[PDB]
């Protein structure tokens, strides 16, 4: 096989082919995670409601196993390889150990895989930052972020994709430790609206609670978007 070295150091100690995979994330669609007391909320932006794209619902927040969901940002094609590699890992795990694997484990796998690509001859790196949420069997909620370097961190709230720093710099001002299912969703959309188009039809989001995953309908959602876009007219009046 072709195992020429792709990911290599430059004079300044940068892995160029990873800096460039992170540039493919920055251009990708923004996605957002929010940990609460009892609930995780992963909220992505879609490319925007074209009249053609199937009325039958396609979900941009991929299920990895019952407990664990992930949103990505970057190259759709690559992400769909990570997800099918994780999905596989979670069931390869259930076979080897009777346990359902916990979030903090699967993240470290997906991260490990994203790393292998930054150090394999033949491969470029995956152009995919990954926001994994989910609940352990014990009851604890977890949110994590895997960036293309392979380096994983766990967050209380987080963004990836376009203007990821603008969202995180906005989030860490207004975030509060203990949050309810409704405050979390409110906050997730609030944070996404900093960067995403004013519209409510692009934002799709998922609310993980213990043993209970539910995507918001575009009816449930537009209540929280009117409630939030009136609060971004209260924060525009002050300044």
């Amino acid at each position: 096989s072709y195992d020429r070295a792709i990911t290599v150091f430059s004079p300044d100690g940068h892995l160029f082919q990873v800096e460039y995979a992170q540039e493919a994330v920055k251009k990708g669609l923004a996605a957002v995670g929010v940990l609460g007391s009892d609930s995780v909320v992963i909220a992505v932006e879609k490319k925007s409601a074209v009249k053609l794209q199937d009325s039958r619902t396609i979900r941009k927040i991929y299920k990895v196993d019952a407990n664990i969901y992930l949103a990505f940002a970057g190259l759709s094609a690559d992400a769909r390889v990570l997800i099918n590699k994780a999905q596989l890992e979670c069931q390869r795990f259930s076979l080897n150990y009777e346990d359902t694997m916990d979030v903090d484990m699967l993240v470290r796998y997906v991260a490990g895989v994203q790393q292998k690509s930054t150090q394999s001859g033949g491969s470029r790196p995956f152009g995919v930052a990954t926001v994994i949420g989910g609940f352990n069997e014990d009851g604890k909620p977890h949110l994590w972020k895997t960036d293309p370097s392979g380096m994983c961190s766990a967050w209380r709230a987080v963004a990836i994709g376009r203007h990821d720093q603008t969202v995180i710099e906005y989030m860490e001002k207004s975030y509060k430790d203990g949050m309810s299912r409704d405050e979390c969703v409110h906050f997730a959309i609030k944070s996404l609206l900093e960067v995403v188009e004013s519209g409510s039809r692009n934002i799709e989001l998922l609310v993980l609670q213990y043993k209970e995953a539910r995507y918001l309908t575009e009816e449930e959602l537009q209540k929280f978007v009117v409630e939030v876009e009136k609060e971004r007219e209260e924060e525009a009046a002050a300044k």
């Binding site: 076979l95 080897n96 150990y97 916990d102 484990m105 014990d138």
Partner: protein, 202 residues
């Protein structure tokens, strides 16, 4: 060999004899048969001593590696399952190891018989080795789920003893362990001939 574990409210007893006989002649009268893997896991060796002492020591590596990686102790479910998947891959490599992985984790006390043929069974009560049949006799008599730790060890020690008394391949020293929420403790280490003069004083 005789080797029995059982589950009660207080936790899990593991009792064993201490003899490794090649049919007729007795090699050793001091075989430590309760393998101490983690500090919350007791493997019991019966059948091919070689295969157990090796695989239950591998299991121990995998249990510790899990503790490092996942920053938290393995379950007994998963511990037994690791052993079960090693014995399954080697089922037609002529392994021989009737093991019992006992332990206490998040989900209460758990006992798992794990065979050579990849078998893996959640037992409330179990006995392995030539003298099992004898242990089960005594053991199914006195065994309730609401024993005190005193009476559970009394029962197990008798059960092993009454296997040592009948089986020729079972004998030596009747070791008992207890598995509690705080780990495992070695209760006793009584010689089986002293035991006869306790249980039948005349």
């Amino acid at each position: 060999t005789t080797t029995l574990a059982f589950r009660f409210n207080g936790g899990i007893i593991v009792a064993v004899d201490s003899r490794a006989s090649t049919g007729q002649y007795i090699a050793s009268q001091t075989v430590m048969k309760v393998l101490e893997i983690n500090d919350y896991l007791l493997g019991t060796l019966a059948g091919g001593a070689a295969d157990c002492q090796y695989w239950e020591r591998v299991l121990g590596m995998e249990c510790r590696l899990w503790e490092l990686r996942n920053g938290s102790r393995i379950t007994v479910a998963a511990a037994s399952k690791i052993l079960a998947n090693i014995t399954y891959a080697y089922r037609n490599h002529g392994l021989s190891m009737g093991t019992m992985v006992a332990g206490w984790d998040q989900f209460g006390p758990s006992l798992y018989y794990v065979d050579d043929k990849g078998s893996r069974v959640k037992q409330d009560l179990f006995s392995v080795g030539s003298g099992s049949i004898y242990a089960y006799g005594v053991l199914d008599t006195g065994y309730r789920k609401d024993l005190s730790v005193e009476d559970a060890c009394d029962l197990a020690r008798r059960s092993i003893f009454h296997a040592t008394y009948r089986d020729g391949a079972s004998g030596g020293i009747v070791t008992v362990y207890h598995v509690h929420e705080k780990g495992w403790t070695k209760i006793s280490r009584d010689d089986q001939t002293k035991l006869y003069h306790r249980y039948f004083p005349s």
